[PDB]
Amino acid sequence: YEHTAVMPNKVGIPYKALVERPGYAPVHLQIQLVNTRIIPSTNLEYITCK
Amino acid sequence: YEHTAVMPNKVGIPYKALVERPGYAPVHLQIQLVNTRIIPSTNLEYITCKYKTKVPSPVVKCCGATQCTSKPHPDYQCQVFTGVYPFMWGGAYCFCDTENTQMSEAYVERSEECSIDHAKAYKVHTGTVQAMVNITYGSVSWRSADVYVNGETPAKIGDAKLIIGPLSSAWSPFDNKVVVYGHEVYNYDFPEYGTGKAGSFGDLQSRTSTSNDLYANTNLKLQRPQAGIVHTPFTQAPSGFERWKRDKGAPLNDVAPFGCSIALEPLRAENCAVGSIPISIDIPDAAFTRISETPTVSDLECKITECTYASDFGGIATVAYKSSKAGNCPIHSPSGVAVIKENDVTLAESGSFTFHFSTANIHPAFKLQVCTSAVTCKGDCKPPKDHIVDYPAQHTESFT
């Protein structure tokens, strides 16, 4: 029942998929990607200022 | 109504057949062959074990020879020796220098471990297989009785008389020749009593533990003690019981075919799931319900709702029960396609009650006999995802 699901990247809205496990009662999802904060890999190269 | 039934040999799962006696209400079975312990015919041929060169203390004649004799001890190796000067606590003690004679003698004897830690050979014949068959029968709901396989033995334990086998699957997982060790059983071509080459298995070969006589081909060869000192060089192969514990073969409860387990107990080979057993029962007629007392269920309808194409009882199906009276109704699929968890279903006046089952064909077109009312529960099933746990309830694979 490991519910794979392709899923649109969009933040503020749930994605209420449905678990179709053969044998027991299905269960809904409610997957709301409340945030997509990224944090790339970076390097402080130099501060500048006046 | 003596319900003959061919029946697959497989241990841990009921076989809920249905008694179709013409005239009275049918009754379900629940035949679970909880065990298939075998206990072939055998013979204790010889215990073996590792020797112990329990040396008798050598003679030392100081000036002249001491001829040895071949005493009847097992593998009584004895060899006279001269040319010693035996240092014993005061330097030497025998005042001669070549006439100093030393007679070494050593025989083989069962270890103390031979009584307890010992391999054990057997000539193994076929014997007669057994089972603690539970039937939670009908409305009887219980009997857990030990039975046989030979096809005329009843066992009137409970109320039902039941005749089993003979099974068609005569594979004794034991070979003809077997060695046995504590619990690990080896279907080994042990050489024989009386012959075993030294170092090889059965260098010591005692009939039993008590048996003072034995066969000890250990290649025990005494050598002369060194440089005029008292001791007994015994040059000998460490036992073929020493090896056979760390250069052995694997156990039959780890290499057998067709699904068996083993015990150093009556020498059974439990739970050997193979083939079928022609089983036949004589039910007590008192346990029957007459036909005019169970509800007639016809004008019904059956349909799957979520069929699981699987082993565990994942298949389900509502049934639009259309009864006449209200009560119980034993159920079964006379086709072996579908195996059902429920033997019996309770009924109000023409309600509906789902049951559980399991199948192997994508389109399960199996009849369902709801207490003398047949119905096709046609439909379609879904494969599962999660297959790593013990053995199935389906056991009905065929062309699909």
Transcribe B288-320 into DSSP letters. Answer: PPBGGGSPP--S-EEEEEEEE-SSSS-EEEEEE
Q: At a CB cut-off of 8 Å and minimum separation 6, what does B201 contact?
A: B48, B119, B179, B188, B190, B191, B240, B241, B243, B244
Q: At a CB cut-off of 8 Å and minimum separation 6, what does B116 contact?
A: none
Radius of gyration over alpha carbons of chain A, in Å? 20
Tell me if B310 and A22 make a contact (CB, 8 A cut-off).
Answer: yes
Q: Check the CA dihedral B388-B390-B392-B398 and report its sign.
A: positive
| DSSP SS3 for B114 | helix
Interface residues of chain A, partner chain B, Cβ below 8 Å? 1-2, 21-23
Q: Any idea what DSSP says for residue B346? A: E
Tell me if B384 and A2 make a contact (CB, 8 A cut-off).
Answer: no
Shortest alpha-carbon distance between residue B14 and chain A (Å): 21
- What are the backbone angles phi and psi of residue B121, rounded to the nearest 5°? -85, 165
Tell me if A22 and B383 make a contact (CB, 8 A cut-off).
Answer: yes
For testing the chain A interface, which of B341, B386, B389 should be mutated: the one with the most A CBs within 10 Å?
Answer: B386
How far are the Cα atoms of A23, A47, B80, B196, B347 from residue B188, in angstroms, in the given order? 47, 82, 40, 13, 59
Burial string for B194-223 (b: 16+ CB within 10 Å, else e) reads eebebbbbbbbbbbeeeeeebbbbbebebe
Q: At what resolution in Å was this solved? A: 6.6
- For residue B77, the surrounding DSSP H or E stretch is strand B77-82
Calpha distance B60→B100 (Å, rounded) = 7
| DSSP SS3 for B188 | coil
Q: Which residue of A has its CA nearest to B381?
A: A22
Of B176, B74, B174, B182, residue with least CA distance to B119: B182
Calpha distance B304→B312 (Å, rounded) = 16
Of B165, B168, B174, residue with least CA distance to B125: B174
Q: What pairs with residue B208 in β-bridges?
A: none
Q: Which residue of A has its CA nearest to B305?
A: A23
Of B176, B64, B75, B162, residue with least CA distance to B123: B176
Contact B331, B368 (CB under 8 A): yes
- H-state helical runs in chain B: 252-255
Burial bucket for residue B284 (CB in 10 Å: 0-12, 13-18, 19+): middle
Q: Any idea what DSSP says for residue B376? A: B
Contact B232, B246 (CB under 8 A): no
Calpha distance B198→B215 (Å, rounded) = 10
Q: Which residue of A has its CA nearest to B309?
A: A22
The distance from CA B250 to its chain's CA centroid, rounded to whole angstroms, is 16
- Give CA angle at B337 (B333, B341), nearest 5°: 55
Calpha distance B160→B29 (Å, rounded) = 11
Extract the tokens encoding A21: 């496990």
Q: Before B166, cis peptide (omega within 30)?
A: yes
How far are the Cα atoms of A7, A43, A44 from residue A39, in angstroms, in the given order? 21, 12, 14
Of B251, B248, B269, B268, residue with least CA distance to B260: B269
Give me the residue label for tokens 């789902």: B354
Shortest alpha-carbon distance between residue A2 and chain B (Å): 8
Burial bucket for residue B351 (CB in 10 Å: 0-12, 13-18, 19+): middle
Give chain B positions within 8 Å (CB) of A2.
385
Q: Are strands B301-308 and B381-382 parallel, antiparallel or unpaired?
A: parallel
Extract the tokens encoding B60: 């030392």
Contact B24, B36 (CB under 8 A): no
Q: Are strands B177-181 and B44-48 parallel, antiparallel or unpaired?
A: unpaired
- What are the backbone angles phi and psi of residue B285, rounded to the nearest 5°? -60, -25
Calpha distance B130→B38 (Å, rounded) = 6
Shortest alpha-carbon distance between residue B301 and chain A (Å): 22
**Residue-level length of chain A:** 50
Give chain A positions within 8 Å (CB) of B312.
23
Q: A-B interface: how many C-beta pairs under 8 angstroms?
A: 19
Contact B203, B48 (CB under 8 A): yes
| DSSP SS3 for B162 | strand
Q: Check the CA dihedral B235-B239-B242-B246 and report its sign.
A: positive
Question: DSSP letter string over B251-263?
Answer: -HHHH-SSS-EE-
Q: At a CB cut-off of 8 Å and minimum separation 6, what does B254 contact?
A: none
Q: Any idea what DSSP says for residue B131? A: B
Extract the tokens encoding B384: 């599962």
Give chain A positions within 8 Å (CB) of B306.
22-23
- CA-based end-to-end distance of chain A: 60
- Give CA angle at B200 (B198, B206), nearest 5°: 70
Q: Which residue of B has its CA nearest to A26?
A: B306
**Residue-level length of chain B:** 400
Extract the tokens encoding B20: 């179709």
Calpha distance B205→B203 (Å, rounded) = 6
Question: DSSP letter string over B197-246?
Answer: PTTSS-SEEESSSS-S-EEE----EE-PPSTTB----EE-PPPTTTTTSS
Of B223, B197, B225, B242, residue with least CA distance to B77: B223
Q: Which residue of A has its CA nearest to B312?
A: A23
- HSE, CB side, 13 Å, CA atoms: give it for residue B218: 31
Contact B281, B20 (CB under 8 A): no
- Count other C-beta atoms under 10 Å from residue B323's C-beta: 22
Q: Which residue of B has its CA nearest to A2?
A: B385
Residues B337/B340/B345/B351 CA torsion (nearest 10 deg): -60
Of B62, B98, B58, residue with least CA distance to B80: B58
Tell me if A23 and B306 make a contact (CB, 8 A cut-off).
Answer: yes
Calpha distance A38→B195 (Å, rounded) = 80
Give chain A positions within 8 Å (CB) of B386.
1
Calpha distance B146→B131 (Å, rounded) = 5
Q: Measured between CB atoms, which of A1, A2, A23 is closest to B308?
A: A23
For testing the chain A interface, which of B306, B307, B362 should be mutated: the one with the most A CBs within 10 Å?
Answer: B306
Calpha distance B118→B50 (Å, rounded) = 8
Tell me if A23 and B385 make a contact (CB, 8 A cut-off).
Answer: no
Give me the residue label for tokens 């000192």: B229
Amino acid identity for residue B65 in this structure: A
| DSSP SS3 for B80 | strand
Interface residues of chain B, partner chain A, Cβ below 8 Å? 306, 308-310, 312, 314, 382-386
Structure determination method? cryo-EM
Calpha distance B10→B43 (Å, rounded) = 28
Give chain B positions within 8 Å (CB) of A21.
385
